[PDB]
Structure formats: structure tokens, C-alpha cells
Structure 1
Amino acid sequence: RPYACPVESCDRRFSRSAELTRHIRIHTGQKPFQCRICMRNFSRSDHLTTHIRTHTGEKPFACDICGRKFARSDERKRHTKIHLR
């Protein structure tokens, strides 16, 4: 952890500089990415991409066992486990 967080009201530490810069947005409240469909702003581009799928209904990740589709890979990951029990 060669880089720490300046805001006295926070005890965070990171390995990289790009990480401390992305983190700082938590405190500055920066939300650079806007959804053109609902106008909601997001702190991250990747979260904006998946959020947009809530409007379009796009579901790229299908369960290997039943084929049920999901907007995000982690949603599918959480689901696949139910085929055990």
C-alpha cells in the first residue's frame, strides 16, 4: 500500500495510483457517466453499462444448466449454485 487516502475522515490504502484516484470519487461525489435513457449519473463506466441493460433487457449470460439469462456475470454465478441445492 504505497498510496493512502488524504481525506482525514477515511482510513483507506491502495496498491496503485489509478485506484486511489477512482476511490477519491467516493468523497468528491463525482459521477462522470450518464445514462441517456433515464439520465441517472454513475461513478463508473462499467456500472453504467450494466445499468443500461435494465432498460434494454439485454441478458448476455446464460446458465450452463438451465439456460436462464442474466444481465451480469455475477447474477448468473449466484444463480448457477441453486442447481446443487
Structure 2
Amino acid sequence: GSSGSSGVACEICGKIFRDVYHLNRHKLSHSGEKPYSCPVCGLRFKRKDRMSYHVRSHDGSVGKPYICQSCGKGFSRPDHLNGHIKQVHSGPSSG
């Protein structure tokens, strides 16, 4: 480095500016999530082949209202979940 001067630091990319004015015009040039950016992370991609594997990779969704406490699948109704917990899960050494 060897460059520890007094200035500002962009809170988007991390670029340093000798003054604030030069940074004022930069913030305006910055893009707002595009063309293909992640709604979760925030990164920006210039391809649909990447963002597609990036977004899905996270899988942001719940689906059903109630979900198991183990496999966390999801059932339309509550009673349906009660039967699963006892069907698949719930099975101690004793009985």
C-alpha cells in the first residue's frame, strides 16, 4: 500500500477519492442492481447463465405455511405435518 492519505471511501465498490465532489459524480454513475443482480446478496452479473446458478443456489422461499422441524419440507395444512413428524420422524429406542 504505502498510501494512507486523508479521503473518503465509496461504500459500494471501495474506491477512494481525494475529495467529496469527485465521489458525488461517481455515486451517480454507479448502477442499481443490473442487468442481472441477486436480490439476496446484491452482486451484479452481465449474464443469465451465471445469475441463474447464483440465485437458485440460494433458494429463497418457504412455500407452505408450516414446515417440518427436521426435513423442513412443508405441508398445506397443519394436521398434515403432524402425521409426517410421527410417520417419518419420531422413533426413539423405546416405545
> Do the two structures share a fold, i.e. TM-score over 0.5?
no
- Structure with greater strand percent: 1
Q: Tell which structure's C-alpha radius of gyration is larger.
A: 2
- Structure with greater helix percent: 1
The higher-RCO structure (CA 8 Å, 6+ apart) is 1
Return the TM-score normalized by structure 1. 0.30
